[PDB]
């Protein structure tokens, strides 16, 4: 058990193993920079905030730490270490998690058609492997992407620039069981903003939202219509004036053929019809990147734990139990 040592850095009290050092703040869970003299390398370093005030909280703190711990991939954040100033289950009320510190996020950053190839390739990459593991990100958007100097990518997720701008139209719905293709159009957003540095659907709302995103791709149609089991959202649109789907070539002029191309399979309101993480990956567009070889599928993930219902202290002591089972990386 590694000696701590305390600090206050902004309100928040910080107990971390000494090896970490000139811990400064970057974002508020809180989150620090430091120094790991174990490795040589800058870090960060998550102190997650009142991880067991309720059944809510600490299914949440179990959850991540149980889906950090799986994450072993390069475009996907990863831990390097997880602890607690606790000595025993009765003590435990804190968890801190480490990982690999990058530069900057998407969103701290137009870019040239070489930079957005490599940018997009590694975040279909990560979630190729994210989602052979049944895992769904939700909240992909240019703040949760770090990014390093060497355009180096890992996907993140802060959970803290509106979130429905990148959002899918269906999430916007309320739709039941969407799937991990809410990702893909996450994707083609994020792609054509750094094609054109402008926000693609910048709605002030959910309605909004929608109605800028029909505006590009048109209403939906009789196959798309089949689909749809909500009469009321079903009458509506078709209450709808209807829109053509837009010339996705004319929307992005100068842009190179195969990024306009790539775009139009992603950002397809069908949800079935829309490109997946790993046929992209092999899209034409990626030629200087892609190699079949070397994109990698994620060990089978569990979440059977989040139909269960248990306790708080029974979600505490499953963290614990993790946080004490942890193996670091080599
Ligand atoms: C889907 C994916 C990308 C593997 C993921 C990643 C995260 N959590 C994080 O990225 N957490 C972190 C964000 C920012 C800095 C961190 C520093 C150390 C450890 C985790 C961090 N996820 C997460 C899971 C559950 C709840 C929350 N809030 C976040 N989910
Ligand atoms: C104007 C609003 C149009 C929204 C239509 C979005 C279509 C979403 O696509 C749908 O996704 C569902 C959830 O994964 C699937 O069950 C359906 O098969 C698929 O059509």
């Known amino acids: ?171 916007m719905l309320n739709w039941m069981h969407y799937n991990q293709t809410v990702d893909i159009w996450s994707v083609g957003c994020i792609m054509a903003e750094l094609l054109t540095g402008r926000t693609l659907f910048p709605g002030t709302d959910h309605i909004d939202q929608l109605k800028l995103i029909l505006r590009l791709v048109g209403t939906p149609g009789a196959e798309l219509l089949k689909k749809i089991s909500s009469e009321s959202a079903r009458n509506y649109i078709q209450s709808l004036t209807q829109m053509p789907k837009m010339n996705f070539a004319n929307v992005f002029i100068g842009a190179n053929p195969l990024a306009v191309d790539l775009l139009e399979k992603m950002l397809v309101l069908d949800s079935d019809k829309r490109i997946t993480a790993a046929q992209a990956l092999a899209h034409a567009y990626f030629a200087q990147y892609h190699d079949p070889d070397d994109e990698p599928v994620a060990d089978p993930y569990d979440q059977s734990f989040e139909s269960r219902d248990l306790l708080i202290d029974e979600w505490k002591s499953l963290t614990y139990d993790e946080v004490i089972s942890f193996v670091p990386p080599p």
């Open 1 to 171: 058990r590694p000696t701590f040592y305390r600090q206050e850095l902004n309100k928040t009290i910080w107990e971390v193993p000494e090896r970490y050092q000139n811990l400064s703040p970057v974002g508020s869970g809180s989150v620090c920079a430091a120094f790991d003299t174990k490795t040589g390398l800058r870090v960060a370093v998550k102190k997650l905030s009142r991880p067991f005030q309720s059944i809510i909280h600490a299914k949440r703190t179990y959850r991540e730490l149980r889906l950090l711990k799986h994450m072993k991939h390069e475009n996907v954040i990863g831990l390097l270490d997880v602890f607690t100033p606790a000595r025993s289950l009765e003590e435990f009320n804190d968890v801190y998690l480490v990982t690999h510190l990058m530069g900057a996020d998407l969103n701290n950053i137009k870019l040239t058609d070489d930079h957005v190839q490599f940018l997009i390739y590694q975040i279909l990459r990560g979630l190729k492997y994210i989602h052979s593991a049944d895992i769904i990100h939700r909240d992909l958007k240019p703040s949760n992407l770090a990014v390093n100097e060497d355009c180096e990518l890992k996907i993140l997720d802060f959970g803290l620039v509106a979130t429905r701008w990148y959002r899918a139209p269906e999430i």
